[PDB]
């Protein structure tokens, strides 16, 4: 029986409120800026290289993606902002590579396409990082990989950062071999010149498609498994190969009919705003994203700062954990309990981080908070269910670790355009450094002047402010993308769908330090 009613979250916000108006203005401005920057990145390497690429008869990489995926299928691009102002004078749109998840012949696949326009498709260090992240995603979620190889090899002026180390270029080939061993299909499509150091990708792959115009490779080397007249033919052949994969999706979770949330998503703009100093109820966000705005809270009156419960997204079950204030002992214990419960029942986990800075409270007895957050950290680390993190606000200190940051391998991690990430708030770091130097130079009997205090403080403030920018964090691959809040639900759906390809296996826990 599934007929009894359930209470729904969410309340209608006050559209007339001045606070709502101001928050809406600020967040809409941020989203417009994000959209403009994304368009500029989408334009690619430049009109020069684009005209040259077209004159050679080859398709532009975005056109390749459009023709490859199923007609009208949504495409989930990752890390559109890699390399954004990362290097001092060189502009590297999209990191020189395009990675995403899309449905080909009814199968979710991870597509990795080199962009020939950007520096002839050379490999900047950020490009290697992006590709490794994509391969890691595909390995974890058991997704076939399709490479659209139009490469130029390592960027020589930066070889020291691309070639030698463990997470450097060679790891790419390593991943390929491993994913072939675990029976995850590898398809390579040599749509560009087969330059030095590039033939390794087709040779490692399970199956190859090579566009006609090395010649020795198809006729004598035999590296070629298929031989295509041009780009369109190659993409069609790729679709045929994917069909011939003999794969069927196995899902192991209960499914229910999906239902839209009761409240419009754009209202989030008013609720969240751009000021981190003001706070908001995470329950509003949860009401905006989950199915039917139906939510079953767990331990509502204990550890009120954390909000944990069960819901459904597009019919899949999810356990939601979010911050609603300063994390405490009770909140940590509640989180550990909830994580154990979700792991036992094999339910995917969704974290929402809105870590609150310690500027409000001087001490907060970091020892006890640490003693309890350690338990939550261990529980999150040992979990095996799919985990997806979303940073809707500040993310500072060990709380970031506790709420499944990058170090804890969430299947995906996205940030809203108003997030901030750093070890601490800038002013707190300034005070810490000032106190350290003051105490030390007092210990040696040296005098500490207030001018020196300002001299230490100001650079730290500016540096922390600059490094906390979402664009700074997404230029490096610290997140899989910056998403417009109004689309959040949709993205999560796609992500969770992909995460369901892999089977869910049992969770083993370490010693629970009681």
């Amino acid at each position: 029986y599934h007929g009894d009613s359930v209470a729904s979250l969410g309340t209608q916000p006050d559209l007339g409120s001045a606070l709502y108006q101001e928050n809406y203005k600020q967040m809409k401005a941020l989203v417009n800026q994000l959209h403009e920057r994304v368009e500029h990145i989408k334009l690619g390497g430049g009109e020069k290289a684009r005209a040259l690429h077209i004159s050679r008869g080859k398709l532009l990489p975005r056109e390749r993606i459009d023709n490859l995926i199923d007609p009208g299928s949504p495409f989930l691009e990752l890390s559109q902002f890699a390399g954004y102002q990362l290097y001092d004078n060189e502009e590297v749109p999209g990191g020189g590579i395009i990675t995403g998840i899309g449905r080909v012949s009814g199968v979710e696949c991870m597509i990795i396409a080199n962009d020939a326009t950007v520096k002839g498709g050379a490999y900047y260090p950020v490009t290697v990082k992006k590709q490794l992240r994509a391969q890691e995603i595909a390995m974890q979620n058991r997704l076939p990989c399709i490479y659209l190889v139009d490469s130029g090899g390592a960027y020589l002026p930066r070889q020291a950062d691309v070639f030698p180390d463990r997470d450097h270029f060679g790891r790419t080939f390593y991943n390929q071999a491993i994913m072939s061993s675990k029976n995850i299909a590898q398809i390579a499509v040599v749509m560009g010149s087969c330059t030095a150091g590039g033939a390794y990708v087709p040779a490692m792959a399970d199956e190859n498609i090579i566009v006609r115009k090395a010649d020795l490779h198809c006729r004598k080397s035999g590296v070629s498994d298929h031989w295509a007249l041009d780009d369109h033919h190659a993409l069609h052949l790729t679709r045929k190969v994917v069909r011939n994969l003999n794969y069927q999706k196995k899902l192991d979770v209960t499914i229910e009919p999906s239902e839209e949330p009761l409240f419009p998503a754009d209202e989030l703009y008013g609720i969240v705003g751009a000021n981190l100093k003001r706070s908001f109820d995470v329950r509003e966000v949860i009401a905006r994203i989950v199915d039917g705005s139906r939510f079953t809270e767990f331990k509502a009156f204990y550890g009120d700062t954390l909000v944990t419960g069960f819901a459904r997204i597009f019919g899949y079950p999810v356990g939601i954990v979010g911050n609603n204030g300063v994390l405490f002992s009770e909140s940590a214990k509640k989180g550990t309990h909830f994580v154990q419960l979700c792991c036992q029942r094999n339910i995917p986990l969704l974290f929402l981080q809105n870590i609150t800075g310690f500027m409000v409270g001087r001490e907060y007895e970091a020892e006890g908070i640490a003693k309890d957050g350690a338990k939550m950290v261990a529980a999150v680390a040992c979990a095996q269910v799919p985990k997806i993190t979303l940073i809707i606000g500040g993310s500072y200190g060990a709380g970031n670790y506790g709420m499944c940051g990058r170090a804890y391998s969430p299947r995906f991690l996205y940030i809203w355009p108003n997030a901030r990430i750093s070890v601490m708030g800038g002013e707190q770091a300034a005070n810490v450094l000032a106190t350290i130097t003051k105490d030390q130079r007092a210990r040696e009997g040296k005098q500490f002047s207030s001018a020196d205090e300002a001299a230490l403080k100001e650079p730290i403030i500016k540096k922390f402010e600059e490094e906390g920018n979402p664009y700074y964090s997404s230029a490096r691959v610290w997140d899989d993308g910056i998403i417009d809040p109004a689309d959040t639900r949709l993205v999560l759906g796609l992500s969770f769908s992909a995460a369901l390809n892999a089977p869910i296996e049992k969770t083993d826990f370490g010693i629970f330090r009681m």
């Binding site: 499914i255 019919g315 993205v491 769908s497």
Partner: protein, 138 residues
């Protein structure tokens, strides 16, 4: 007489809708009935998808750029003119009928795609538009 712009718009909409119907048929069999990937939305992160299509009218080849709007309507630009088109296929009796609005003008016809030719039968007449063969095969 040579086919107008709007007839080409209707034909392109019909072909897109048939692709959507095929996607639905594949979805019905699969385990993941409610996955968002099965939607024919064409959504992208922070970008709007534009699909370049080529349709053959008589001897002439005409290129249509179809932008997949968020609302589900399609913005098709052919040459210098952009047309807002929203439509759906429903079955009248045993025949598939396309009802579609182009720039707010509603038209009703019956649509049959056999081989590479799209036939729109309406009270005004019959319009035949030919999908070019990829010609890499056949």
């Amino acid at each position: 007489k040579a086919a107008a712009k709007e007839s080409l718009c209707q034909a392109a909409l019909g072909l897109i809708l048939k692709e959507k119907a095929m996607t639905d048929t594949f979805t019905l069999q699969a385990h993941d009935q409610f996955s968002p990937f099965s939607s024919s939305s064409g959504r992208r992160l922070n970008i709007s998808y534009t699909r370049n299509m080529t349709l053959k009218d008589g001897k002439n080849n005409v290129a249509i750029a179809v932008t997949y709007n968020h609302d589900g309507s399609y913005s098709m630009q052919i040459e210098d003119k952009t047309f807002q088109v929203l439509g759906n296929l429903y079955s009248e009796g045993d025949c598939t009928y396309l009802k579609c609005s182009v720039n707010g003008v509603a038209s009703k016809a019956k649509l049959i795609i056999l081989e590479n030719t799209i036939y729109l039968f309406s009270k005004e007449g019959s319009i035949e538009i030919d999908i070019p063969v990829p010609k890499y095969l056949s």
